[PDB]
mmCIF file of C-alpha atoms in Angstrom:
data_model
loop_
_atom_site.group_PDB
_atom_site.id
_atom_site.type_symbol
_atom_site.label_atom_id
_atom_site.label_comp_id
_atom_site.label_asym_id
_atom_site.label_seq_id
_atom_site.Cartn_x
_atom_site.Cartn_y
_atom_site.Cartn_z
ATOM 1 C CA UNK A 1 -8.378 12.994 -22.831
ATOM 2 C CA UNK A 2 -5.320 14.939 -24.151
ATOM 3 C CA UNK A 3 -4.856 16.453 -20.974
ATOM 4 C CA UNK A 4 -5.092 13.068 -19.087
ATOM 5 C CA UNK A 5 -2.578 11.411 -21.597
ATOM 6 C CA UNK A 6 -0.013 14.099 -21.031
ATOM 7 C CA UNK A 7 -0.447 13.777 -17.184
ATOM 8 C CA UNK A 8 -0.078 9.985 -17.240
ATOM 9 C CA UNK A 9 2.939 10.194 -19.835
ATOM 10 C CA UNK A 10 4.827 12.815 -17.427
ATOM 11 C CA UNK A 11 4.100 10.565 -14.319
ATOM 12 C CA UNK A 12 5.502 7.529 -16.368
ATOM 13 C CA UNK A 13 8.654 9.486 -17.412
ATOM 14 C CA UNK A 14 9.020 10.616 -13.642
ATOM 15 C CA UNK A 15 8.806 7.130 -12.351
ATOM 16 C CA UNK A 16 11.057 5.303 -14.679
ATOM 17 C CA UNK A 17 13.888 8.270 -14.087
ATOM 18 C CA UNK A 18 13.604 8.107 -10.534
ATOM 19 C CA UNK A 19 14.970 4.635 -10.298
ATOM 20 C CA UNK A 20 18.488 4.265 -9.088
ATOM 21 C CA UNK A 21 21.213 2.958 -11.588
ATOM 22 C CA UNK A 22 20.693 -0.853 -10.725
ATOM 23 C CA UNK A 23 16.741 -0.250 -11.318
ATOM 24 C CA UNK A 24 15.257 -0.107 -7.877
ATOM 25 C CA UNK A 25 12.444 2.207 -6.915
ATOM 26 C CA UNK A 26 13.176 3.444 -3.194
ATOM 27 C CA UNK A 27 11.201 5.290 -1.025
ATOM 28 C CA UNK A 28 10.470 5.898 2.919
ATOM 29 C CA UNK A 29 13.231 6.287 5.397
ATOM 30 C CA UNK A 30 14.019 5.158 8.871
ATOM 31 C CA UNK A 31 17.192 7.367 9.602
ATOM 32 C CA UNK A 32 19.905 5.488 11.258
ATOM 33 C CA UNK A 33 17.580 2.284 11.668
ATOM 34 C CA UNK A 34 15.951 0.271 8.776
ATOM 35 C CA UNK A 35 17.173 3.315 6.406
ATOM 36 C CA UNK A 36 15.411 3.226 2.853
ATOM 37 C CA UNK A 37 12.954 0.702 1.416
ATOM 38 C CA UNK A 38 13.393 -0.853 -2.054
ATOM 39 C CA UNK A 39 11.964 -4.519 -2.132
ATOM 40 C CA UNK A 40 8.666 -3.441 -1.058
ATOM 41 C CA UNK A 41 8.521 -0.067 -2.945
ATOM 42 C CA UNK A 42 9.817 -1.790 -6.063
ATOM 43 C CA UNK A 43 7.107 -4.566 -5.947
ATOM 44 C CA UNK A 44 4.272 -2.104 -5.020
ATOM 45 C CA UNK A 45 5.550 0.397 -7.954
ATOM 46 C CA UNK A 46 5.974 -2.154 -10.565
ATOM 47 C CA UNK A 47 2.397 -3.516 -9.763
ATOM 48 C CA UNK A 48 1.050 -0.306 -9.974
ATOM 49 C CA UNK A 49 2.716 0.434 -13.512
ATOM 50 C CA UNK A 50 1.477 -3.162 -14.808
ATOM 51 C CA UNK A 51 -1.850 -1.259 -15.960
ATOM 52 C CA UNK A 52 0.205 0.759 -18.513
ATOM 53 C CA UNK A 53 0.168 -0.681 -22.074
ATOM 54 C CA UNK A 54 3.661 0.233 -22.747
ATOM 55 C CA UNK A 55 6.464 -1.771 -23.776
ATOM 56 C CA UNK A 56 9.297 0.237 -21.977
ATOM 57 C CA UNK A 57 7.133 0.031 -18.891
ATOM 58 C CA UNK A 58 6.878 -4.007 -19.071
ATOM 59 C CA UNK A 59 10.701 -3.904 -19.561
ATOM 60 C CA UNK A 60 11.144 -1.917 -16.090
ATOM 61 C CA UNK A 61 8.642 -4.525 -14.567
ATOM 62 C CA UNK A 62 10.535 -7.302 -16.117
ATOM 63 C CA UNK A 63 14.074 -5.891 -14.563
ATOM 64 C CA UNK A 64 12.299 -5.225 -11.178
ATOM 65 C CA UNK A 65 11.428 -8.931 -10.818
ATOM 66 C CA UNK A 66 14.979 -9.922 -11.722
ATOM 67 C CA UNK A 67 16.214 -7.472 -8.831
ATOM 68 C CA UNK A 68 13.536 -9.258 -6.526
ATOM 69 C CA UNK A 69 14.808 -12.596 -7.471
ATOM 70 C CA UNK A 70 18.421 -11.687 -6.683
ATOM 71 C CA UNK A 71 17.032 -10.836 -2.959
ATOM 72 C CA UNK A 72 17.133 -14.510 -2.258
ATOM 73 C CA UNK A 73 18.859 -14.123 1.135
ATOM 74 C CA UNK A 74 16.010 -15.109 3.364
ATOM 75 C CA UNK A 75 15.489 -19.170 3.748
ATOM 76 C CA UNK A 76 11.627 -18.788 3.583
ATOM 77 C CA UNK A 77 11.846 -17.076 0.346
ATOM 78 C CA UNK A 78 9.971 -14.095 1.569
ATOM 79 C CA UNK A 79 10.793 -10.328 0.627
ATOM 80 C CA UNK A 80 10.519 -7.444 3.201
ATOM 81 C CA UNK A 81 10.895 -3.743 3.546
ATOM 82 C CA UNK A 82 14.670 -3.731 2.172
ATOM 83 C CA UNK A 83 17.621 -6.023 2.400
ATOM 84 C CA UNK A 84 18.319 -5.505 6.225
ATOM 85 C CA UNK A 85 14.544 -6.145 7.339
ATOM 86 C CA UNK A 86 13.155 -9.631 7.747
ATOM 87 C CA UNK A 87 10.083 -11.137 5.486
ATOM 88 C CA UNK A 88 6.803 -9.764 5.929
ATOM 89 C CA UNK A 89 3.532 -10.828 4.303
ATOM 90 C CA UNK A 90 2.528 -7.525 2.623
ATOM 91 C CA UNK A 91 5.774 -7.230 0.778
ATOM 92 C CA UNK A 92 5.744 -10.762 -0.279
ATOM 93 C CA UNK A 93 2.193 -10.193 -1.468
ATOM 94 C CA UNK A 94 2.984 -7.018 -3.538
ATOM 95 C CA UNK A 95 6.173 -9.152 -5.198
ATOM 96 C CA UNK A 96 3.749 -12.030 -6.212
ATOM 97 C CA UNK A 97 1.335 -9.426 -7.793
ATOM 98 C CA UNK A 98 4.304 -8.351 -9.796
ATOM 99 C CA UNK A 99 5.053 -11.690 -10.597
ATOM 100 C CA UNK A 100 1.635 -12.420 -11.952
ATOM 101 C CA UNK A 101 2.296 -9.220 -14.417
ATOM 102 C CA UNK A 102 5.724 -10.493 -15.791
ATOM 103 C CA UNK A 103 4.158 -14.080 -16.068
ATOM 104 C CA UNK A 104 6.209 -15.740 -13.205
ATOM 105 C CA UNK A 105 3.421 -16.843 -10.982
ATOM 106 C CA UNK A 106 4.548 -20.392 -11.384
ATOM 107 C CA UNK A 107 8.460 -19.657 -11.033
ATOM 108 C CA UNK A 108 10.393 -21.725 -8.305
ATOM 109 C CA UNK A 109 10.694 -18.567 -6.131
ATOM 110 C CA UNK A 110 7.004 -17.568 -6.619
ATOM 111 C CA UNK A 111 5.954 -20.934 -5.284
ATOM 112 C CA UNK A 112 8.269 -20.580 -2.422
ATOM 113 C CA UNK A 113 7.146 -17.186 -1.495
ATOM 114 C CA UNK A 114 3.408 -18.302 -2.161
ATOM 115 C CA UNK A 115 3.905 -21.222 0.365
ATOM 116 C CA UNK A 116 5.796 -18.763 2.947
ATOM 117 C CA UNK A 117 2.706 -16.269 2.667
ATOM 118 C CA UNK A 118 0.159 -19.100 3.284
ATOM 119 C CA UNK A 119 2.008 -19.494 6.858
ATOM 120 C CA UNK A 120 0.882 -16.044 7.926
ATOM 121 C CA UNK A 121 -2.698 -16.994 7.944
ATOM 122 C CA UNK A 122 -4.207 -16.697 11.359
ATOM 123 C CA UNK A 123 -6.773 -18.876 13.181
ATOM 124 C CA UNK A 124 -9.375 -16.016 12.534
ATOM 125 C CA UNK A 125 -8.757 -16.146 8.761
ATOM 126 C CA UNK A 126 -6.913 -12.951 8.299
ATOM 127 C CA UNK A 127 -2.928 -12.508 7.189
ATOM 128 C CA UNK A 128 -0.415 -11.286 9.841
ATOM 129 C CA UNK A 129 2.390 -9.108 8.619
ATOM 130 C CA UNK A 130 5.287 -10.755 10.595
ATOM 131 C CA UNK A 131 5.946 -14.045 12.243
ATOM 132 C CA UNK A 132 7.020 -13.260 15.855
ATOM 133 C CA UNK A 133 10.274 -15.220 15.644
ATOM 134 C CA UNK A 134 11.282 -13.475 12.840
ATOM 135 C CA UNK A 135 10.645 -9.978 13.734
ATOM 136 C CA UNK A 136 11.922 -10.541 17.337
ATOM 137 C CA UNK A 137 15.248 -11.466 15.756
ATOM 138 C CA UNK A 138 15.605 -8.354 13.441
ATOM 139 C CA UNK A 139 14.381 -5.525 15.907
ATOM 140 C CA UNK A 140 16.505 -3.972 18.448
ATOM 141 C CA UNK A 141 14.231 -2.415 21.355
ATOM 142 C CA UNK A 142 14.915 -2.232 25.001
ATOM 143 C CA UNK A 143 13.415 -4.858 27.223
ATOM 144 C CA UNK A 144 12.323 -7.296 24.590
ATOM 145 C CA UNK A 145 11.744 -9.960 26.996
ATOM 146 C CA UNK A 146 8.507 -7.785 28.558
ATOM 147 C CA UNK A 147 7.425 -6.521 25.112
ATOM 148 C CA UNK A 148 4.032 -8.247 23.652
ATOM 149 C CA UNK A 149 4.250 -8.559 19.742
ATOM 150 C CA UNK A 150 0.317 -9.026 19.943
ATOM 151 C CA UNK A 151 -0.242 -6.086 17.464
ATOM 152 C CA UNK A 152 2.591 -6.603 14.843
ATOM 153 C CA UNK A 153 2.038 -10.265 14.526
ATOM 154 C CA UNK A 154 -1.913 -10.194 15.038
ATOM 155 C CA UNK A 155 -3.920 -10.334 11.575
ATOM 156 C CA UNK A 156 -4.190 -7.079 9.514
ATOM 157 C CA UNK A 157 -6.773 -6.005 7.452
ATOM 158 C CA UNK A 158 -4.664 -3.745 5.109
ATOM 159 C CA UNK A 159 -2.257 -6.679 4.631
ATOM 160 C CA UNK A 160 -5.319 -9.273 4.202
ATOM 161 C CA UNK A 161 -7.037 -6.660 1.658
ATOM 162 C CA UNK A 162 -3.845 -6.334 -0.503
ATOM 163 C CA UNK A 163 -3.193 -10.205 -0.419
ATOM 164 C CA UNK A 164 -6.630 -10.853 -1.476
ATOM 165 C CA UNK A 165 -5.699 -9.292 -4.893
ATOM 166 C CA UNK A 166 -4.096 -12.910 -5.366
ATOM 167 C CA UNK A 167 -7.063 -14.992 -6.727
ATOM 168 C CA UNK A 168 -5.329 -18.203 -4.797
ATOM 169 C CA UNK A 169 -5.958 -16.283 -1.318
ATOM 170 C CA UNK A 170 -9.064 -14.669 -2.005
ATOM 171 C CA UNK A 171 -11.291 -17.608 -1.044
ATOM 172 C CA UNK A 172 -9.330 -18.092 2.423
ATOM 173 C CA UNK A 173 -9.487 -14.463 3.335
ATOM 174 C CA UNK A 174 -13.208 -13.951 2.128
ATOM 175 C CA UNK A 175 -14.909 -14.387 5.572
ATOM 176 C CA UNK A 176 -12.399 -12.367 7.535
ATOM 177 C CA UNK A 177 -12.880 -9.299 5.207
ATOM 178 C CA UNK A 178 -16.676 -9.690 5.311
ATOM 179 C CA UNK A 179 -16.768 -9.790 9.341
ATOM 180 C CA UNK A 180 -14.131 -6.375 9.547
ATOM 181 C CA UNK A 181 -16.411 -4.145 7.435
ATOM 182 C CA UNK A 182 -17.518 -1.287 9.484
ATOM 183 C CA UNK A 183 -21.444 -0.065 9.858
ATOM 184 C CA UNK A 184 -20.260 3.103 7.656
ATOM 185 C CA UNK A 185 -19.098 0.777 4.726
ATOM 186 C CA UNK A 186 -15.412 1.058 5.274
ATOM 187 C CA UNK A 187 -12.627 -0.960 6.462
ATOM 188 C CA UNK A 188 -9.916 0.208 8.732
ATOM 189 C CA UNK A 189 -6.171 -0.663 8.152
ATOM 190 C CA UNK A 190 -3.348 -1.333 10.623
ATOM 191 C CA UNK A 191 -0.160 0.154 9.130
ATOM 192 C CA UNK A 192 -1.986 3.020 7.232
ATOM 193 C CA UNK A 193 -3.493 6.353 8.194
ATOM 194 C CA UNK A 194 -5.779 6.549 4.959
ATOM 195 C CA UNK A 195 -8.751 4.194 5.349
ATOM 196 C CA UNK A 196 -9.441 4.655 1.634
ATOM 197 C CA UNK A 197 -6.306 2.331 1.099
ATOM 198 C CA UNK A 198 -7.869 -0.925 2.758
ATOM 199 C CA UNK A 199 -11.334 0.031 1.778
ATOM 200 C CA UNK A 200 -10.571 0.301 -2.060
ATOM 201 C CA UNK A 201 -8.537 -3.035 -1.896
ATOM 202 C CA UNK A 202 -10.956 -4.852 -0.021
ATOM 203 C CA UNK A 203 -14.032 -3.792 -2.061
ATOM 204 C CA UNK A 204 -11.913 -4.678 -5.173
ATOM 205 C CA UNK A 205 -11.115 -8.223 -4.087
ATOM 206 C CA UNK A 206 -14.990 -8.652 -3.370
ATOM 207 C CA UNK A 207 -15.745 -7.595 -6.658
ATOM 208 C CA UNK A 208 -12.971 -9.547 -8.526
ATOM 209 C CA UNK A 209 -14.565 -12.660 -6.586
ATOM 210 C CA UNK A 210 -17.918 -12.093 -8.568
ATOM 211 C CA UNK A 211 -20.210 -13.348 -5.548
ATOM 212 C CA UNK A 212 -23.586 -12.046 -5.797
ATOM 213 C CA UNK A 213 -23.724 -12.349 -2.134
ATOM 214 C CA UNK A 214 -21.076 -9.917 -1.718
ATOM 215 C CA UNK A 215 -22.721 -7.101 -3.853
ATOM 216 C CA UNK A 216 -24.316 -5.393 -0.970
ATOM 217 C CA UNK A 217 -20.878 -4.950 0.698
ATOM 218 C CA UNK A 218 -19.221 -3.661 -2.051
ATOM 219 C CA UNK A 219 -22.012 -0.954 -2.947
ATOM 220 C CA UNK A 220 -21.744 0.175 0.872
ATOM 221 C CA UNK A 221 -18.173 0.725 0.371
ATOM 222 C CA UNK A 222 -18.800 2.710 -2.846
ATOM 223 C CA UNK A 223 -21.542 4.859 -0.918
ATOM 224 C CA UNK A 224 -18.680 5.691 1.739
ATOM 225 C CA UNK A 225 -16.344 6.421 -1.072
ATOM 226 C CA UNK A 226 -18.684 9.063 -2.510
ATOM 227 C CA UNK A 227 -19.423 10.472 1.012
ATOM 228 C CA UNK A 228 -15.545 10.987 1.493
ATOM 229 C CA UNK A 229 -15.020 12.849 -1.556
ATOM 230 C CA UNK A 230 -15.772 16.427 -1.664
ATOM 231 C CA UNK A 231 -17.682 18.304 -4.461
ATOM 232 C CA UNK A 232 -14.235 19.874 -5.515
ATOM 233 C CA UNK A 233 -12.834 16.293 -6.153
ATOM 234 C CA UNK A 234 -10.451 15.346 -3.188
ATOM 235 C CA UNK A 235 -10.507 13.327 0.010
ATOM 236 C CA UNK A 236 -9.846 15.802 2.790
ATOM 237 C CA UNK A 237 -7.619 14.707 5.724
ATOM 238 C CA UNK A 238 -6.627 16.094 9.014
ATOM 239 C CA UNK A 239 -3.199 16.599 7.583
ATOM 240 C CA UNK A 240 -4.277 17.801 4.313
ATOM 241 C CA UNK A 241 -7.434 19.519 4.721
ATOM 242 C CA UNK A 242 -7.444 20.793 1.259
ATOM 243 C CA UNK A 243 -6.986 17.191 -0.149
ATOM 244 C CA UNK A 244 -4.581 14.222 0.061
ATOM 245 C CA UNK A 245 -3.298 13.129 -3.447
ATOM 246 C CA UNK A 246 -2.798 9.212 -1.981
ATOM 247 C CA UNK A 247 -6.233 8.963 -0.294
ATOM 248 C CA UNK A 248 -7.910 10.578 -3.559
ATOM 249 C CA UNK A 249 -6.289 8.279 -5.783
ATOM 250 C CA UNK A 250 -7.506 5.220 -3.609
ATOM 251 C CA UNK A 251 -10.967 6.577 -3.407
ATOM 252 C CA UNK A 252 -11.084 6.973 -7.208
ATOM 253 C CA UNK A 253 -10.177 3.238 -7.455
ATOM 254 C CA UNK A 254 -13.104 2.451 -5.006
ATOM 255 C CA UNK A 255 -15.533 4.742 -7.157
ATOM 256 C CA UNK A 256 -14.812 2.601 -10.258
ATOM 257 C CA UNK A 257 -16.807 -0.290 -9.083
ATOM 258 C CA UNK A 258 -20.080 1.253 -9.579
ATOM 259 C CA UNK A 259 -20.328 2.001 -13.433
ATOM 260 C CA UNK A 260 -24.049 2.854 -13.394
ATOM 261 C CA UNK A 261 -24.835 5.589 -10.955
ATOM 262 C CA UNK A 262 -24.644 8.951 -12.518
ATOM 263 C CA UNK A 263 -23.499 10.972 -9.277
ATOM 264 C CA UNK A 264 -20.569 8.513 -8.780
ATOM 265 C CA UNK A 265 -19.348 8.826 -12.391
ATOM 266 C CA UNK A 266 -19.684 12.965 -11.956
ATOM 267 C CA UNK A 267 -17.421 12.280 -8.632
ATOM 268 C CA UNK A 268 -14.962 10.434 -10.304
ATOM 269 C CA UNK A 269 -14.595 13.212 -13.065
ATOM 270 C CA UNK A 270 -14.054 15.698 -10.296
ATOM 271 C CA UNK A 271 -11.341 13.685 -8.840
ATOM 272 C CA UNK A 272 -9.468 13.214 -12.151
ATOM 273 C CA UNK A 273 -10.028 16.962 -12.785
ATOM 274 C CA UNK A 274 -8.284 17.747 -9.186
ATOM 275 C CA UNK A 275 -5.698 15.403 -9.509
ATOM 276 C CA UNK A 276 -4.669 16.657 -12.891
ATOM 277 C CA UNK A 277 -4.427 20.345 -11.305
ATOM 278 C CA UNK A 278 -2.287 18.993 -8.434
ATOM 279 C CA UNK A 279 0.417 17.235 -10.344
ATOM 280 C CA UNK A 280 3.892 18.966 -9.970
ATOM 281 C CA UNK A 281 5.915 20.230 -13.224
ATOM 282 C CA UNK A 282 8.220 17.255 -12.904
ATOM 283 C CA UNK A 283 5.411 14.809 -13.348
ATOM 284 C CA UNK A 284 5.186 13.512 -9.822
ATOM 285 C CA UNK A 285 2.510 14.410 -7.078
ATOM 286 C CA UNK A 286 3.023 15.753 -3.513
ATOM 287 C CA UNK A 287 4.129 12.931 -1.169
ATOM 288 C CA UNK A 288 0.823 11.900 1.063
ATOM 289 C CA UNK A 289 1.694 8.063 1.699
ATOM 290 C CA UNK A 290 1.452 7.912 5.407
ATOM 291 C CA UNK A 291 2.824 4.608 6.907
ATOM 292 C CA UNK A 292 2.468 4.659 10.440
ATOM 293 C CA UNK A 293 4.313 2.741 13.161
ATOM 294 C CA UNK A 294 2.252 1.286 16.137
ATOM 295 C CA UNK A 295 3.704 0.110 19.174
ATOM 296 C CA UNK A 296 4.154 -3.653 18.850
ATOM 297 C CA UNK A 297 1.585 -4.613 21.404
ATOM 298 C CA UNK A 298 -0.848 -2.201 19.961
ATOM 299 C CA UNK A 299 -3.849 -4.219 18.769
ATOM 300 C CA UNK A 300 -5.737 -1.220 18.090
ATOM 301 C CA UNK A 301 -3.584 1.800 16.238
ATOM 302 C CA UNK A 302 -6.955 3.703 15.099
ATOM 303 C CA UNK A 303 -7.534 4.127 18.855
ATOM 304 C CA UNK A 304 -4.099 5.772 19.306
ATOM 305 C CA UNK A 305 -4.674 9.413 19.705
ATOM 306 C CA UNK A 306 -0.627 10.567 20.111
ATOM 307 C CA UNK A 307 0.254 10.144 16.314
ATOM 308 C CA UNK A 308 3.066 12.760 15.286
ATOM 309 C CA UNK A 309 4.959 12.963 11.909
ATOM 310 C CA UNK A 310 8.563 11.876 12.450
ATOM 311 C CA UNK A 311 10.088 14.678 10.357
ATOM 312 C CA UNK A 312 8.509 17.214 12.568
ATOM 313 C CA UNK A 313 9.568 15.937 15.859
ATOM 314 C CA UNK A 314 12.253 17.950 17.762
ATOM 315 C CA UNK A 315 14.998 16.428 19.940
ATOM 316 C CA UNK A 316 15.208 12.674 21.041
ATOM 317 C CA UNK A 317 12.516 10.720 18.979
ATOM 318 C CA UNK A 318 11.502 7.212 18.588
ATOM 319 C CA UNK A 319 9.595 5.598 15.427
ATOM 320 C CA UNK A 320 6.805 3.927 17.686
ATOM 321 C CA UNK A 321 4.021 6.162 17.813
ATOM 322 C CA UNK A 322 4.953 8.119 14.621
ATOM 323 C CA UNK A 323 4.143 8.524 11.129
ATOM 324 C CA UNK A 324 6.464 8.482 8.161
ATOM 325 C CA UNK A 325 6.219 9.241 4.577
ATOM 326 C CA UNK A 326 7.034 8.597 0.891
ATOM 327 C CA UNK A 327 10.316 11.290 0.838
ATOM 328 C CA UNK A 328 10.842 10.617 -2.765
ATOM 329 C CA UNK A 329 7.119 10.806 -3.966
ATOM 330 C CA UNK A 330 7.307 7.668 -5.908
ATOM 331 C CA UNK A 331 5.015 5.585 -3.855
ATOM 332 C CA UNK A 332 2.325 8.309 -4.314
ATOM 333 C CA UNK A 333 3.035 9.257 -7.837
ATOM 334 C CA UNK A 334 2.811 5.487 -8.638
ATOM 335 C CA UNK A 335 -0.708 5.137 -6.799
ATOM 336 C CA UNK A 336 -2.123 8.302 -8.679
ATOM 337 C CA UNK A 337 -1.185 7.332 -12.233
ATOM 338 C CA UNK A 338 -2.378 3.976 -11.791
ATOM 339 C CA UNK A 339 -5.972 5.212 -10.577
ATOM 340 C CA UNK A 340 -5.930 7.949 -13.629
ATOM 341 C CA UNK A 341 -5.271 5.091 -16.004
ATOM 342 C CA UNK A 342 -7.811 2.889 -14.407
ATOM 343 C CA UNK A 343 -10.325 5.652 -14.222
ATOM 344 C CA UNK A 344 -9.755 7.360 -17.725
ATOM 345 C CA UNK A 345 -12.086 4.632 -19.850
ATOM 346 C CA UNK A 346 -15.131 5.601 -17.582
ATOM 347 C CA UNK A 347 -15.159 9.198 -18.043
#
């Protein structure tokens, strides 16, 4: 436990010191286009840090909420990737989770944002990231008149899973989240390479609902998570064959939804041990939060075989069909420390 405490405290120090002077957490980059994310990253990192019982962390969260309130430039009341992007449902969801942590769920901005988030609900019962009219105004791509946005404006399981953390959206999204579970027990996301993200968030939402009917689905997801974790205590990926910190943190969160099984308990202990070993001297973990950018018409990004990492491409390049990452390691570090704090009592 002493090791865990030092690891968590070093990560908290990194994250608080990694803010800019205004107080934003910034991460990800679309060079010479959308640039660096702030609203989305700050909402997410704030939410991750809400599990800490520290006064100075709660002060940082309250400042993060003030900064989000200052970003009131969109008429819908939504938030986005950063100032220059249009509003999106995922960002707005994470912002409302942060609002809940600082007791602002019934604030006028939170009510406005909640109403806007509700309009993204589709006929199939899932949440869409973008409204077509909004994202069409914002992007500058050739031949926009002959480009479908069926992918970017369709219902997304990763966003639905995140939004379902809000109790007031859980009932609306329940059936959609149930039908989208695979035969292997997991869910597949749209914007994310790692299925552990969407799978953990969906299983958490169903657990939080507490329906007896959903318990078999939750247990199937936990069984998938146990399979995904190697004996050494990591989730191996194509990009990180010796362990992704981001995928491992989300898998650790998934494995918390079973408190009785002895092998699941052992698996979490292996994951904690490995994550402790992987921590950098400055308190961070190595960047592995892989956000992918499908083509706007791509309904099935999990069946796109051409993914490349944007920073590794030589010559003239496009963001479509590429993968970007959290270059500052803030998004990854926030994810890992949250998983360690949540998992520590169940050792």
